[PDB]
Amino acid sequence: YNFDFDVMHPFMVRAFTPFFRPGNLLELGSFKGDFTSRLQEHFNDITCVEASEEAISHAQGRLKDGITYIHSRFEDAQLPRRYDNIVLTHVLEHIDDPVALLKRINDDWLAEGGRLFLVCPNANAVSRQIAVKMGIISHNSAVTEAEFAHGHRCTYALDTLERDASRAGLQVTYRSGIFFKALANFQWDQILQTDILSKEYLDGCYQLGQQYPDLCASIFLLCEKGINQ
Amino acid sequence: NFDFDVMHPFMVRAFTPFFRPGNLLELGSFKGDFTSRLQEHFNDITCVEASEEAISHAQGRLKDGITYIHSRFEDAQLPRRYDNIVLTHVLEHIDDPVALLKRINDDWLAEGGRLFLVCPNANAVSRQIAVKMGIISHNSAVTEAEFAHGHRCTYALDTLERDASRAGLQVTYRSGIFFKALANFQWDQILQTDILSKEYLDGCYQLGQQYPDLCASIFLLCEKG
Amino acid sequence: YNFDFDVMHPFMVRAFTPFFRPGNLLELGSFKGDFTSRLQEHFNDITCVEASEEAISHAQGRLKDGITYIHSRFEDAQLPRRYDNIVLTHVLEHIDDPVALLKRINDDWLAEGGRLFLVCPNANAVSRQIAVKMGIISHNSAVTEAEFAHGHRCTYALDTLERDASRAGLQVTYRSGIFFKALANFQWDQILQTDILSKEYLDGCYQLGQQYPDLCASIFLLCEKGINQ
Amino acid sequence: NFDFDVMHPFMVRAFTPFFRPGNLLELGSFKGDFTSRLQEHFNDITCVEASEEAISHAQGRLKDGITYIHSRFEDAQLPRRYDNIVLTHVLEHIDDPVALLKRINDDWLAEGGRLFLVCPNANAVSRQIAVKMGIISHNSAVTEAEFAHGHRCTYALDTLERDASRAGLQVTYRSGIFFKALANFQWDQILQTDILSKEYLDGCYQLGQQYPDLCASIFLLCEKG
Ligand SMILES: [Cl-]
Ligand SMILES: [Cl-]
Ligand code: NA
Ligand code: NA
């Protein structure tokens, strides 16, 4: 059990489902294709952009047909088309110039009526706030040493995430949160090996999280295209 | 009027990303004040309203493309099932709310259809301040004036989802509409002044989504169970 | 490990400590003396009112000197004195007429300058809200069957608790919450047998709970005497 | 003025149940506006203020029982240690806030003494609405105007407790003062009207305690580590 892959990925797909547009999907930062496989249950026409040849090859081997793979960094990517749905989940925090990426999404890649599904780890998640109170993390939006090593350049909260989307020219249509998270991953991974927490308890955390977006594991902005000339 | 001038447009904004293609049923359409806004999104709207006077008034002021059904909910015979059903600021008046919601689930929602269920929120900031002030006993109380207006309940997210769930609906999304720190009587006064802008109101709508429990109205997006 | 006795009792004493007045203390509903023993670290002159002869006898055996024991129901209790500190923790929810008890506290028992420490289980605790979303409990302020069996007649939240204090003539001076609680007791009691959660993590829950009173395990009103004639 | 007329009295209300018997030190007492309120609770108050003009003004308008110390914090030589230390709306101006807090911990607090640390809150409702409106980039930003006024930080509970902790203080209680949904410029306008009562303001103070993160100002009660 990995909390991110086994718990968060499915709830993210749940969170997105009511907002999906008919048509195609673009997955930015598809890596090894773990999230793509869930998206394939919803879309037959998926385009995947990933900078790592190794990751993109693994995906290619594992996933079913109907994926267009684009091996590129986002700033160099030349896409053949515009997209009805764009997924950017746990990628923006790794980008040196996040406004410039969101701006490409707005200006170059969103179809008319298209939607961006923008999801990042939340600074203000309960578990993270507890770690801040414990002094393990200096403050909520801090980037820790491990985090920086893993490539994080920011730790978004709803305030700074909407700022950057807004700065990029996107229209933010909906703000929400995914999964009320009171334990840290290291704790989840241990507890999930036990029968202490049920699947219903997890579903409850998802359900309650919608009522306290600011306290969830990940925060979620639904965005639409704004006119920029 | 805060409710018609501020709340109605934000309710439509909140629904817009969830609307399904197809038709729409408005339950409790009254004089058509909300229907007019919905007409910007749908050419095929069916309206159910028990007051003949109200429904007559709407018919007078709305554009073509409306099927009007003059009936109590318990008596209503609808000719189709619906991709979108709106029940906004109605359920808190209903003596047996779960029974109405169960008709929606079992009879009126199309497969794939969505119910837009919106009710005034007991935990709204302005109401909580009124409770702290001793004006209202507690958040989910029904005041004498509200009871006189026909309220039988003051929903919060907990009680509203309970009733939807008991009816057999699948509650898909929970949210709030408008971060509300002032009472209607105060808004109606301040709205005559230039102390608050439209951008302020927009800001309250945006912030509201981040604190659903504190909003003016709470919103459950539901699907057929 | 019992979450209530091992985790909540000590945090309750922490929560109270900054507000304690010099002088004596009255503990209403002292039962077997589990909480009294912690209070004895702070006060040498404690008066304990308890309706159960069995419980009050157990306390008597176990606790150190400096306790005045009063075996009475609250409505019949004739106390010799007024008190600088009154503790009513997890008792008010068991009372058929809670305003009438709080009114005795205001009118008969609080000394001038005296403080009431009023603590009840919170309807809106995170764990409880999750159980509501799971459909195990109908709504936050519901009283479940097990709860009713244990003697609960109400499940307070900050709104209804301040209402009743106010109705009784008390002045509510401070509102807070004790312990950010995302798991149910049955889960705590299992997890506490493991090394999954540390003492620092628990302290973090206490610390964060103060910032979200409405979501804590127990809610806490600090009250002072109001004039009633 | 919202800050002097509403905020100051609620700050005293918030401190009152935590006050220790003994003496009190007010750091950054300026013209004595807050000191006058504290004088209702303490006969032995020591005031530290760097502006000679300000401190002269206070001396003119305050009652006996005040020791005035005209000094920068870094230079201040205090004759005693203090049972109560007040540092309200000062720390956000200090270039090295942890260094000031460390002097408080190590040199000025009496054993058993309490520090009343209060700063304007980045996550205040009114500020969050301003951020959603695009007026301020984000909650903890410092605006040009605020920077011109000397702010170097916009604290929230997370950053304020971080700095107190780094100084070696023991953070004993965390709270908020005043649930604030309107900006000062809006309060100052609405306060001229009769749209909001004193009971409304009291209600905002009461509700604020239940949502510290959303208050006008945040309040840490600290003790010596
Ligand atoms: Cl159907
Ligand atoms: Cl000392
Ligand atoms: Na442009
Ligand atoms: Na009386």
Query: Which ligand neighbours the alpha carbon of A227 most closely?
Result: 3
Task: Give me the amino acid identity at A155.
Answer: T
Across the interface, whether the CB atoms of C174 and D211 are under 8 A apart is answered: no
Largest CA distance in chain B: 49
Q: What are the chain D neighbours of C115 within 8 Å (beta carbons)?
A: 17
How big is the A-C interface in CB pairs under 8 Å? Answer: 56
Note whether D38 contacts B: Cβ–Cβ < 8 A: no
What does the DSSP 8-state code read for residue A126?
H
**Alpha-carbon distance B89 to B74, whole Å?**
18
Resolution (A): 1.7
Of the candidates D123, A212, D158, the residue with the CA atom closest to the CA atom of residue C207: D158
Q: Report whether B93 contacts B119 (CB < 8 A).
A: no
Alpha helices in chain D (DSSP H): 2, 8-15, 33-38, 52-61, 97-103, 125-132, 144-148, 157-167, 184-192, 198-208
Residue of D nearest to A131 (CA): D158
- With tokens 């109400």, the residue in question is C154
Largest CA distance in chain C: 56
**Alpha-carbon distance A165 to A162, whole Å?**
5
Triad A118, A123, A125: Cα angle to 5°? 95
**Alpha-carbon distance C146 to C102, whole Å?**
25
Q: Report whether A115 contacts A8 (CB < 8 A).
A: no
**Strand-pair category, A67-71 with D24-27:** unpaired
**Alpha-carbon distance D143 to D154, whole Å?**
9
Note whether B170 contacts D: Cβ–Cβ < 8 A: no
Note whether C130 contacts A: Cβ–Cβ < 8 A: yes
Note whether D130 contacts B: Cβ–Cβ < 8 A: yes
Query: Which ligand neighbours the alpha carbon of C227 most closely?
Result: 4
Residues 6+ apart with CB under 8 A from B195: D186, D189, D190
Q: Report whether B85 contacts B46 (CB < 8 A).
A: no
As a whole number of Å, the CA-based R_g of chain B is: 17
A227 Cα: distance to centroid of ligand 3 (angstroms) = 8
**Alpha-carbon distance C5 to B26, whole Å?**
53
**Alpha-carbon distance A100 to D155, whole Å?**
29
Cα C64 off chain centre by: 22
Q: What are the chain C neighbours of D219 within 8 Å (beta carbons)?
A: none
Across the interface, whether the CB atoms of B181 and D181 are under 8 A apart is answered: yes
Of the candidates B45, B49, B22, the residue with the CA atom closest to the CA atom of residue B35: B45
Note whether D138 contacts A: Cβ–Cβ < 8 A: yes
Note whether B171 contacts A: Cβ–Cβ < 8 A: yes
Return the bridge partners of D179, or none. D215
Q: What are the chain C neighbours of D211 within 8 Å (beta carbons)?
A: 212-214
Cite the beta strand spans of C61-184 per DSSP E.
Answer: 67-71, 83-89, 110-121, 171-180
**Alpha-carbon distance D129 to B208, whole Å?**
10
Technique employed here was X-ray
Q: Report whether C27 contacts C43 (CB < 8 A).
A: no
CA distance B191 to chain D (A): 11
CA distance D138 to chain A (A): 6
What does the DSSP 8-state code read for residue B8?
H
**Strand-pair category, C25-28 with A110-121:** unpaired
Across the interface, whether the CB atoms of B138 and C163 are under 8 A apart is answered: yes
Cα C216 off chain centre by: 13
Q: Enter the tokens of residue C3.
A: 């979450």
Note whether B170 contacts A: Cβ–Cβ < 8 A: no
**Alpha-carbon distance B5 to A216, whole Å?**
33
Note whether B19 contacts A: Cβ–Cβ < 8 A: no
C227 Cα: distance to centroid of ligand 4 (angstroms) = 8
Chain breaks in chain A (C to N over 2.5 A) after: none
CA distance C175 to chain D (A): 6
SS3 B28: coil
Strand arrangement, sheet containing A83-89: A67-71, A46-50, A25-28, A83-89, A110-121, A216-224, A171-180
For chain D, report the end-to-end CA distance as a whole number of angstroms.
37
Helix pair B198-208, B8-15: axis angle to 10 deg: 50
Q: What are the chain C neighbours of D173 within 8 Å (beta carbons)?
A: 18, 176, 210
As a whole number of Å, the CA-based R_g of chain D is: 17
Return the bridge partners of B117, or none. B87, B220
CA distance B82 to chain A (A): 17
**Alpha-carbon distance A2 to A10, whole Å?**
12
**Alpha-carbon distance D64 to D33, whole Å?**
15
Note whether C132 contacts B: Cβ–Cβ < 8 A: yes
SS3 C167: helix
Which structural domains are found in chain B, ordered by start?
A: 1-225 (3.40.50.150)
Of the candidates D187, D161, D160, D189, the residue with the CA atom closest to the CA atom of residue D7: D187
How big is the B-C interface in CB pairs under 8 Å? Answer: 23
Q: Report whether A36 contacts A27 (CB < 8 A).
A: yes
Across the interface, whether the CB atoms of D210 and C211 are under 8 A apart is answered: no
Distances (CA, A) of A49 to A13, A24, A33, D66, D198: 19, 14, 10, 69, 59
**Strand-pair category, C46-50 with C67-71:** parallel
H or E stretch at B26? strand B24-27
**Alpha-carbon distance D215 to D113, whole Å?**
25
What does the DSSP 8-state code read for residue D64?
S
Return the bridge partners of A174, or none. A222
Q: Report whether D119 contacts D218 (CB < 8 A).
A: yes
Q: Enter the tokens of residue C138.
A: 């109908």
Subunit partners of chain D (3 or more CB pairs within 8 A): A, B, C
Strand arrangement, sheet containing D82-88: D66-70, D45-49, D24-27, D82-88, D109-120, D215-223, D170-179
**Alpha-carbon distance C70 to C50, whole Å?**
6
Helix pair D198-208, B125-132: axis angle to 10 deg: 110
